[PDB]
Amino acid sequence: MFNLFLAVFPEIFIINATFILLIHGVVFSTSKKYDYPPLASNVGWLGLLSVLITLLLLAAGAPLLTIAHLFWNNLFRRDNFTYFCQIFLLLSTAGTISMCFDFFDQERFDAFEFIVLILLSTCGMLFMISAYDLIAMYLAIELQSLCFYVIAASKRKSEFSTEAGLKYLILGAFSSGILLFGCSMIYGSTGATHFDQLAKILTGYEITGARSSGIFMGILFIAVGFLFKITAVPFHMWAPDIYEGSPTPVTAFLSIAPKISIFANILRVFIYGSYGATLQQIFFFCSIASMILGALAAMAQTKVKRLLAYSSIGHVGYICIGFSCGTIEGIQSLLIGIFIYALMTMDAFAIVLALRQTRVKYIADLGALAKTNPILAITFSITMFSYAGIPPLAGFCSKFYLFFAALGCGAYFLALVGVVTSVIGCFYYIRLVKRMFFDTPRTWILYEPMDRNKSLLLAMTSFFITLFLLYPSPLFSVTHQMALSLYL
Amino acid sequence: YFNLSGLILCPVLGSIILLFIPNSRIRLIRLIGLCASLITFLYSLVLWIQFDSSTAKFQFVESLRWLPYENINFYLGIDGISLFFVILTTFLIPICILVGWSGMRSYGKEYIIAFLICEFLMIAVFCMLDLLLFYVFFESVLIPMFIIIGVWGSRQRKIKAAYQFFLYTLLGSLFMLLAILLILFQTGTTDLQILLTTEFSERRQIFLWIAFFASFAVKVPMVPVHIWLPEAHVEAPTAGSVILAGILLKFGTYGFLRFSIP
């Protein structure tokens, strides 16, 4: 009986480690001997250690992920796609935890429950990727949504943080209601909630005889809810406001982690929910609109975080290009784009957090950065060019292969929109590089040097971005392996 | 045995060495940059000597895997057409270094480093036999030249000229990239030796030719897109103009000779 739980040690470990960290923090924060120590950095380091140990548990136990698959069949399904998605998710969480260490000291964020809630959200997303049922997917989505609602309003005294948390909670609850109504309408029309059953019942009757109103409506509502979750327009109701008002270490996590898991869910819904290519049209329109709106909205931004939010929306549209073209080479392009975008976003948010110790708010603030810190300016310019998609950098490979996938299915209209949006994006990305190097402001802002964690993260990510084209084979190999394993 | 690998790695080592040298040692930076440029030029001259002039096959071929299924890979080779372009693009760099000798105390290491990266990226352009990677190194030159035009410009107009050059180059680049993608999907590979032995349908030849012309005509200004060249030429350092007039204007002609015409 104990060996049936060999498939859930990575989750059991992280759950128990979160419990131990919570007990440790609550016991020793409210202590008289140690004069109420602000043990946020301690809990952060121990949580990073826990993440690394559960990464070791999950990665090493690769043959054991299919163990007791019949017993766990109704609960979750673990396969090669889940394995790599979960490993990438743990890596991103560890990177975010590493970045947010300096936030706890200079700004004096002494609340240790931030790390505990991050770990609980990580557990929710681990259960999300392997979820093979509507019920499990909904529960994991709600768990991570609550863990994010709580930490979005962590800055209680801040006007922006409270409003951002309120807007985030309202939007997320509305999206969850729409998704949940879609799930109810699907369950009431087919009588099944498991993905295997829901694939066997829908794969044959491909609207050949008539269009099932209930099934079509449920599919549409689930798609709409998921589109709210990833903030693809016109379902970006308050996403820029949430990104701006949220704390920067918090904004770093929501910009990366909630996207990997939700995209995994959308893929595991496409494996069965391809009902008459209905989602392919919805994602087609959503991707075009997302690229256009992100490109046309990030040029009218003077703040760094709003520009990052609109960049995230544009890259979500670029990724949804892969959804619109349903093929192995489309899903592979989608996953490569997700990986590259996550790494670039981690790079950019580490750079922003490095300058956040001096309260950077506007693009003009980073005006004379090429004179005071002439290597941080180079790193930020590299990240901006990678966002733009300049050929020599790693950001070009994702857009290249996504455009190739789009042209494979024969959608020539998507390619033209992507090209125009790429031109606009490159313009407003090199606009930032103009400020750092070419302008000569009268007043300069001097920043204090960053710490070791963010310096190492920036160095590694910048070496990845510039030198990815030389050795891109492993990423393509693992991505092609994941895309094929979605069905066999 | 002198091959194309060493000729490309010499500027790489030259740029890496200067990357980690203190800026106070101005003499050492200039000496090492000039020595690297001269060594690269001598390497090119030696490559000329051992060049067979009786075979149409590409010589000194080198391969390095890029995609996991060897669909597209780093294929480097020279022929009687691109040999002199390589020699010229390695000869011009030491002259550019020597131009800014007196004033180098103000530019710093980022000047010689930018020129060495330029040389590394332009040697690979004339040596690539893969259509897609020829585009990758074709439009990687923008970043070093963008930095050269903007950081070390003459007046405040340097921002406008850099924007115009970059925007025109992007407009050509992506419209050519779409054609490259269409060729890759249909043919199956992007190797020049395979693309030169594939019978393209008559209808697709005009569209692909126009798309290739869009990117190349900008870099060899015909008539309607010759309005960026004068502004970029005037708003550039003395050595920067040599690169734009000596090499960057030879990309369009070489692109027409190597890909479009066959």
Partner: peptide, 26 residues
């Protein structure tokens, strides 16, 4: 050059994106 080529070019009239990007607040 300075006239039709510039007005129909990238900045004579293609700078309407300033009158287009700023409208995205709607």
């Amino acid at each position: 050059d300075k006239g039709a080529i510039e007005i129909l070019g990238p900045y004579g009239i293609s700078y309407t994106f300033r009158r287009l990007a700023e409208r995205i607040s709607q």
